[PDB]
């Protein structure tokens, strides 16, 4: 027995290890913990624009209604505030943002759990090979290791698509809200 | 060969069992949900606090405004001014909000460290066992196994400090949300 009989030597060991390594490459040194926080700060940043969004909605509707006492005499001023309210019909993308976030937060929890399952199953595979008479059981554990590594990568891939989209939409609606605030006063 | 058996890969040496047992009661502390749940638990504290922080400054502004309005008639409205001043004494709680902030930064740092050390522990024990099975390095096997134990103890130390700091953060959060709630309701009625 020597050191390198303990390293991915079979071909399914090599594949599982390849799949495990580019998980390691995707997360890199800050690992799953950085990827969990990045969602939580997504959520927080959203919550802040959510509340700016409802603040400005209330204020525009109130200024509108005050002016509408004398609707005839201030119709064009009313039409401008109606124009800000049309611009602020963005309820559908706050909902879309909260959907991406719910999905990101679920997929990174699954990705972490799947990552660990892969490492464990590869380790059990290797042990089963080194135990000399169980290479079929070695093979099964090393294939499960790859199938867990692959579940992890797909979970990470959706995490990234959904976090990216939540960011693009967060920035769209922060702009609309900022534009309505600057417009209004 | 038929020499190298399954139990042979398990903690067999004294240092390996020491590091094993430290690893397992990290595993028992964090449970099935693991570091992810505990990292989220800090995030959840942080938001909660942000909401109470902003109710704090909300009611602070409104009491001070209400007070000044009355103080345009200082002598005619003095007892009504004393009550408002009483709410301001009650709300002199800035120190508590910084302390929560201090508990939350510590907790979020310590769970990040705990997670790193836990990983380093499992890698070191794995390397130790491998070195023993390699047959001529039981001294370098001992060193990685001792290393494994020292990382596990680093993680447990970080998890202890995490739990204490999250606990104190939570107790201090209840105090402020209650003072604020009380201030909010004395000001309405």
Residue ranges per domain, chain A?
Answer: 9-21+31-184
The CATH fold of domain B30-188: Ferritin (1.20.1260)
Q: Residue A13's CB: how many other CB atoms inside 10 A? A: 21
Cβ atoms of B56 and B91 closer than 8 Å: yes
What is the rounded CA–CA span in Å between residue B189 and residue A75? 40
Cβ atoms of B17 and A11 closer than 8 Å: no
Tell which residue, B180, B68, B150, A5, has the closest CA to residue B142.
B150
Cα A62 to the center of its chain, rounded Å:
37
| Contact residues for B74 (Cβ-Cβ < 8 A; gap 6+) | B81
Experimental technique used to determine this entry: X-ray
* Residue B49, burial from CB neighbour count under 10 angstroms (0-12, 13-18, 19+): buried
* Residue A54, burial from CB neighbour count under 10 angstroms (0-12, 13-18, 19+): exposed
CA angle B13, B25, A7 (to 5 degrees): 50
Report chain B residues whose CB lies below 8 A from the CB of A31: 115-116, 119
Looking at residue B91, the DSSP 8-state letter turns out to be T
Contact A113/B at CB under 8 A: yes
Residue B50 in tokens: 């942000």
Indicate the class that CATH gives domain A9-21+31-184: mainly alpha
Q: How many CA atoms lie within 13 A of B15 on its CB side?
A: 22
Contact A109/B at CB under 8 A: yes
What is the rounded CA–CA span in Å between residue A119 and residue A123? 6
Backbone phi, then psi, for A133, in 5-degree steps? -105, 40
Query: Inter-chain contact B134–A47, Cβ cutoff 8 Å?
Result: no
Cβ atoms of B152 and B120 closer than 8 Å: no
Instruction: Compute, in degrees rounded to 10, the torsion defined by CA atoms B41, B46, B48, B52.
Output: 160
Residue A7 in tokens: 């390293």
Alpha-carbon distances, residue B119 vs A7, B35, B148 (angstroms): 19, 11, 10
In chain A, the largest separation of any two C-alpha atoms, in whole Å, equals: 94
Residue A90 in tokens: 């963005």
> Considering CB atoms only, which of B4, B111, B112 is closest to A1?
B4
Tell which residue, B40, B34, B20, has the closest CA to residue B125.
B20
What is the rounded CA–CA span in Å between residue B169 and residue B56? 16
Residues in chain A: 185
Report chain B residues whose CB lies below 8 A from the CB of A23: none
> Considering CB atoms only, which of A3, A43, A131 is closest to B130?
A3
Residue B122 in tokens: 């499992």
Sign of CA dihedral B181, B186, B188, B189: positive
Report chain B residues whose CB lies below 8 A from the CB of A37: 39, 43, 108
What is the rounded CA–CA span in Å between residue B144 and residue B11? 13
Tell which residue, B95, B96, B100, has the closest CA to residue B45.
B100
Query: Inter-chain contact A112–B36, Cβ cutoff 8 Å?
Result: yes
Cβ atoms of B47 and B166 closer than 8 Å: no
Resolution in A: 2.2
| Contact residues for A103 (Cβ-Cβ < 8 A; gap 6+) | A158, A162
Residue A69 is inside which H or E element, if any?
A: none
Question: Could you tell me the end-to-end alpha-carbon distance of chain A, in angstroms, rounded to an integer?
Answer: 78
> Considering CB atoms only, which of B5, B39, B116 is closest to A37?
B39
DSSP per-residue codes, A111-128 = HHHHHHHHHHHHHHHHHH
Cβ atoms of B106 and B165 closer than 8 Å: yes
């Amino acid at each position: 027995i020597k050191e390198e009989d303990f390293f991915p030597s079979t071909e399914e060991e090599k594949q599982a290890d390849k799949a495990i390594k580019d998980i390691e490459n995707l997360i890199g040194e800050s690992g799953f913990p950085e990827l969990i926080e990045n969602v939580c700060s997504l959520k927080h940043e959203y919550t802040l624009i959510r509340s700016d969004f409802y603040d400005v909605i209330t204020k525009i509707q109130n200024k509108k209604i005050s002016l509408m006492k004398n609707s005839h005499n201030n119709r064009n001023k009313i039409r401008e505030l109606v124009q800000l309210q049309n611009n602020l019909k963005i309820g559908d993308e706050l909902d879309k943002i909260m959907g991406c976030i719910d999905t990101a937060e679920q997929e990174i929890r699954s990705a972490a759990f799947f990552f660990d399952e892969a490492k464990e199953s590869l380790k059990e595979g290797i042990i089963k090979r080194l135990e000399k008479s169980k290479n079929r059981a070695a093979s099964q554990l090393s294939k499960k290791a790859l199938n867990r590594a692959e579940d992890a990568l797909r979970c990470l891939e959706n995490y990234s698509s959904k976090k990216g989209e939540a960011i693009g939409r967060r920035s769209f609606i922060k702009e609309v809200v900022e534009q309505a605030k600057n417009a209004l006063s």
